[PDB]
Amino acid sequence: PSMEDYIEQIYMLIEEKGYARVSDIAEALAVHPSSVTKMVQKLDKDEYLIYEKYRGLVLTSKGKKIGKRLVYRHELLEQFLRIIGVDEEKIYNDVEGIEHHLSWNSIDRIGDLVQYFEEDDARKKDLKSIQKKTEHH
């Protein structure tokens, strides 16, 4: 997991539970707690989050903005693969593997693509028609 992977999951946990426990981060990323503590320290140093005494892990404004961006990117990519017809079961793992290796330019263009299809269902129908061609013929 990259730094973006950690911030993405920390943001999600804070929104889901209201806080992000090291044990919960470790579970979400399927890694050892030590790996989390190491990354958390790096994120603290880079000012993405803090840990004032008790209370707990808290994202800084910089961490919150990036986290929101990452969840947006994840959601958008799933919608993209869903719209173009990828089997639902395969969508998550694919987004997991590509999301943090795409420039913002690509993300924003994929965003335009999604809007393109959402704007007129007729385009989705024509796309399905093409899938039928490339299917047999």
Any binding-site annotation on 8?
yes
- Contact string 48-87 vs a copy of itself (x = CB under 8 A): ---------------------------------x--xxxx
Q: How far is the C-alpha of 70 from the C-alpha of 11, rounded, in Å? A: 9
Which residue from 53, 54, 112, 137 is in contact with a copy of itself, where contact means CB under 8 A? 112
**Least distance (Å) between residue 117 CB and a copy of itself:** 10
- Which CB contacts under 8 angstroms, 24+ apart, belong to 31-36? 31/1, 35/1, 36/6
Any binding-site annotation on 96?
yes
At 59, which helix (H) or strand (E)? strand 58-59
Tokens at 60, concatenated: 């800084």
Interface with a copy of itself (CB under 8 A), residue total 31
Cite the annotated binding site for Mn(2+) by residue number.
5, 8, 74, 96, 99-100
